[PDB]
Scaffold this active site. Structure first.
Site, mmCIF file in Angstrom:
data_model
loop_
_atom_site.group_PDB
_atom_site.id
_atom_site.type_symbol
_atom_site.label_atom_id
_atom_site.label_comp_id
_atom_site.label_asym_id
_atom_site.label_seq_id
_atom_site.Cartn_x
_atom_site.Cartn_y
_atom_site.Cartn_z
ATOM 1 N N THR A 264 11.166 26.331 -12.668
ATOM 2 C CA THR A 264 10.464 27.353 -11.898
ATOM 3 C C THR A 264 11.481 28.313 -11.255
ATOM 4 O O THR A 264 11.376 29.540 -11.401
ATOM 5 C CB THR A 264 9.619 26.703 -10.791
ATOM 6 O OG1 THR A 264 10.435 25.779 -10.062
ATOM 7 C CG2 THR A 264 8.433 25.958 -11.370
ATOM 8 N N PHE A 389 3.176 30.216 -5.445
ATOM 9 C CA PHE A 389 3.544 28.915 -4.876
ATOM 10 C C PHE A 389 2.341 28.007 -4.587
ATOM 11 O O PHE A 389 2.455 27.035 -3.841
ATOM 12 C CB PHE A 389 4.395 29.098 -3.611
ATOM 13 C CG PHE A 389 5.765 29.681 -3.868
ATOM 14 C CD1 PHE A 389 6.770 28.909 -4.453
ATOM 15 C CD2 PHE A 389 6.051 30.994 -3.511
ATOM 16 C CE1 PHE A 389 8.042 29.446 -4.687
ATOM 17 C CE2 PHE A 389 7.318 31.545 -3.746
ATOM 18 C CZ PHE A 389 8.313 30.769 -4.328
ATOM 19 N N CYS A 396 3.467 24.796 -2.687
ATOM 20 C CA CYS A 396 4.842 24.407 -2.937
ATOM 21 C C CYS A 396 5.588 24.033 -1.657
ATOM 22 O O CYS A 396 5.825 24.887 -0.801
ATOM 23 C CB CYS A 396 5.580 25.544 -3.651
ATOM 24 S SG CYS A 396 7.257 25.109 -4.044
HETATM 25 C C1 HEM Z 1 10.206 29.870 -7.894
HETATM 26 C C2 HEM Z 1 10.223 28.539 -7.779
HETATM 27 C C3 HEM Z 1 8.952 27.672 -7.604
HETATM 28 C C4 HEM Z 1 7.660 27.962 -7.889
HETATM 29 C C5 HEM Z 1 7.066 29.269 -8.473
HETATM 30 C C6 HEM Z 1 6.864 26.806 -7.549
HETATM 31 C C7 HEM Z 1 5.493 26.696 -7.671
HETATM 32 C C8 HEM Z 1 4.715 25.644 -7.220
HETATM 33 C C9 HEM Z 1 3.270 25.550 -7.298
HETATM 34 C C10 HEM Z 1 2.346 26.627 -7.928
HETATM 35 C C11 HEM Z 1 2.886 24.379 -6.763
HETATM 36 C C12 HEM Z 1 1.436 23.851 -6.645
HETATM 37 C C13 HEM Z 1 1.110 23.006 -7.888
HETATM 38 C C14 HEM Z 1 -0.336 22.547 -7.975
HETATM 39 O O1 HEM Z 1 -1.230 23.059 -7.248
HETATM 40 O O2 HEM Z 1 -0.621 21.639 -8.796
HETATM 41 C C15 HEM Z 1 4.088 23.701 -6.312
HETATM 42 C C16 HEM Z 1 4.153 22.473 -5.696
HETATM 43 C C17 HEM Z 1 5.285 21.742 -5.403
HETATM 44 N N1 HEM Z 1 6.605 22.157 -5.534
HETATM 45 FE FE1 HEM Z 1 7.178 24.081 -6.129
HETATM 46 N N2 HEM Z 1 7.713 25.834 -7.067
HETATM 47 C C18 HEM Z 1 9.005 26.319 -7.083
HETATM 48 C C19 HEM Z 1 10.140 25.651 -6.663
HETATM 49 C C20 HEM Z 1 10.231 24.374 -6.138
HETATM 50 C C21 HEM Z 1 11.436 23.689 -5.669
HETATM 51 C C22 HEM Z 1 12.862 24.300 -5.684
HETATM 52 C C23 HEM Z 1 11.066 22.460 -5.247
HETATM 53 C C24 HEM Z 1 11.899 21.293 -4.657
HETATM 54 C C25 HEM Z 1 13.154 21.404 -4.200
HETATM 55 C C26 HEM Z 1 9.633 22.348 -5.431
HETATM 56 C C27 HEM Z 1 8.875 21.238 -5.137
HETATM 57 C C28 HEM Z 1 7.496 21.152 -5.147
HETATM 58 C C29 HEM Z 1 6.736 19.984 -4.743
HETATM 59 C C30 HEM Z 1 7.247 18.611 -4.250
HETATM 60 C C31 HEM Z 1 5.279 20.376 -4.920
HETATM 61 C C32 HEM Z 1 4.061 19.504 -4.596
HETATM 62 C C33 HEM Z 1 3.787 19.758 -3.106
HETATM 63 C C34 HEM Z 1 2.602 18.945 -2.652
HETATM 64 O O3 HEM Z 1 1.549 19.038 -3.322
HETATM 65 O O4 HEM Z 1 2.700 18.193 -1.645
HETATM 66 N N3 HEM Z 1 9.166 23.521 -5.973
HETATM 67 N N4 HEM Z 1 5.183 24.497 -6.621
#
Ligand code: HEM
Length: 451
Positions: A264, A389, A396
């Protein structure tokens, strides 16, 4: 409800038997509109593309995060980590409570040095290229993001800038993710044809578990304190339950950070540079800022926050090509969507992010144009119109981490080099879990500014 073309008893399913499913779904949304039904043998979902409908889908009293079949398969190695757990599972809220403070903007102060460590390695790599060499952009961005999450996450060095073949952990993760994706198209998953696929998958799970479990064990044994998420997780207590995360869940969280974050974030940096070299006026503006702001040999935390236009470039890149895949929701109870579409408890929705970001009714008719100036701005953006996000409590957790990383790295890149689109690169978007501009290459001419 509008629905795309069917393949007899396989319904719509072969439509996603393609190298580029999200882009295919965008083309379906273009001809079908703000909502379409998508059916597979024994399964159904509804793809949403307008802010009108997505705004309602984002109402947490009516809809909660669903695990798509893809996430269910990813759960085979991501376990009950944050990304692949249900909101109602004990371990979701427990880890959320513990981890939220470790992912705040303030917490970025503690990760900054290790982010700079890897960013300097990237800059030095490019400083050391010979005259007639080029940069493989997504490849180097992925080296950077993997190593950064590795260092910041559990103080482990994958040393990606020292190798052609990635660390075996990385190879196993990439292969496990590709296999999780492959299962989506298997009508007879018990067929002998897949015996090797299953054997390799178990092997890859073991590679990942063994490394992470060892690191966690080593750390508990030494009592060493580091500036990493692992230290936070070993020390943390959920204020609600009063419980800490157990070792297995800690392992799942570390694997999860790498799965959710590396591609991502890498994709974001790659698309951002793509748009910059295709829009030299914007590049000039971003580069002016980088030079004016980053006055020290290495950037400070404070200085990254001041890279406002770089931030705007990154948001505009996330608008056009959000790198994380469409997220899934389920109806908590019977409910009617948009006054037209009655839904039953459990009915699923998909938020087609790139389509939302092209809602000509929200952004104007110029949605296809790259204009960071859209994000001047901000918070004038209608609620739920920009969602790279995700949403609400299931948004996120790593958003601040991803943007700090990307702003720091892009700023350093723009400070240290002039970039040339020497091939006049034609955008070709590869899809894995996430989107990237495949085969995007540039030449970088050093401005000869010392670190
Ligand atoms: C441009 C970079 C990123 C984008 C566009 C992005 C996008 C997203 C999105 C759309 C979700 C929701 C997913 C869903 O509804 O099923 C999510 C959740 C999550 N992301 Fe990111 N992400 C990015 C970077 C990161 C990074 C760098 C980390 C960790 C260091 C991370 C860790 C997580 C975690 C642990 C979740 C689940 C959160 C929860 O539901 O409690 N992401 N992300």
């Amino acid at each position: 409800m509008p629905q795309p073309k069917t393949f007899g008893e396989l319904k719509n399913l072969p439509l996603l038997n393609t190298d580029k499913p999200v882009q295919a779904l965008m083309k379906i949304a273009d001809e079908l509109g703000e909502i379409f039904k998508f059916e597979a043998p024994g399964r159904v979902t509804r793809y949403l593309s307008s802010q009108r409908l997505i705004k309602e889908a984002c109402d947490e009293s009516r809809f909660d995060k669903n695990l798509s079949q893809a996430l269910k398969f990813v759960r085979d190695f991501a376990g009950d980590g944050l990304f692949t757990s249900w909101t109602h599972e004990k371990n979701w809220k427990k880890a959320h409570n513990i981890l939220l403070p470790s992912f705040s903007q303030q917490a970025m102060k503690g990760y900054h040095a290790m982010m700079v460590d890897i960013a300097v390695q990237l800059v030095q790599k490019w400083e050391r290229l010979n005259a007639d060499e080029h940069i493989e952009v997504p490849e180097d961005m992925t080296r950077l993001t993997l190593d950064t999450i590795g260092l910041c996450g559990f103080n482990y060095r994958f040393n990606s800038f020292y190798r052609d073949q990635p660390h075996p952990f990385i190879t196993s993760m990439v292969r496990a993710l590709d296999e999780a994706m492959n299962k989506l198209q298997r009508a007879n998953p018990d067929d002998p044809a897949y015996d090797e696929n299953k054997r390799q998958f178990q092997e890859d799970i073991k590679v990942m578990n063994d490394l992470v479990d060892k690191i966690i064990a080593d750390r508990k044994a030494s009592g060493e304190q580091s500036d990493d998420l692992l230290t936070h997780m070993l020390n943390g207590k959920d204020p609600e339950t009063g419980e800490p995360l157990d070792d297995e869940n800690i392992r799942y969280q570390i694997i999860t950070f790498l799965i959710a974050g590396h591609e991502t974030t890498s994709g974001l940096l790659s698309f951002a540079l793509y748009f910059l070299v295709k829009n030299p006026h914007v590049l000039q503006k971003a580069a002016e800022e980088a030079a004016r702001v980053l006055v020290d040999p290495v950037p400070s935390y404070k200085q990254v926050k001041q890279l406002k236009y770089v931030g705007m470039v990154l948001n505009e890149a996330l608008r056009l090509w959000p790198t994380a895949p469409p997220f899934s929701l389920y109806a908590k109870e019977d409910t009617v969507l948009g006054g037209e579409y009655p839904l039953e408890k459990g009915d699923e929705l998909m938020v087609l992010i790139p389509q939302l970001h092209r809602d000509k009714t929200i952004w104007g008719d110029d949605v296809e144009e790259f204009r960071p100036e859209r994000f001047e701005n901000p918070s004038a953006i209608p609620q739920h119109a920009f969602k790279p996000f995700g949403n609400g409590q299931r948004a996120c957790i790593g958003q601040q981490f991803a943007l700090h990383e990307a702003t720091l790295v892009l700023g350093m890149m723009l400070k240290h080099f002039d970039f040339e689109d020497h091939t006049n690169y034609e955008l070709d978007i590869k899809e894995t879990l996430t989107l990237k501009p495949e085969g995007f290459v540039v030449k970088a001419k050093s401005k000869k500014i010392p670190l």
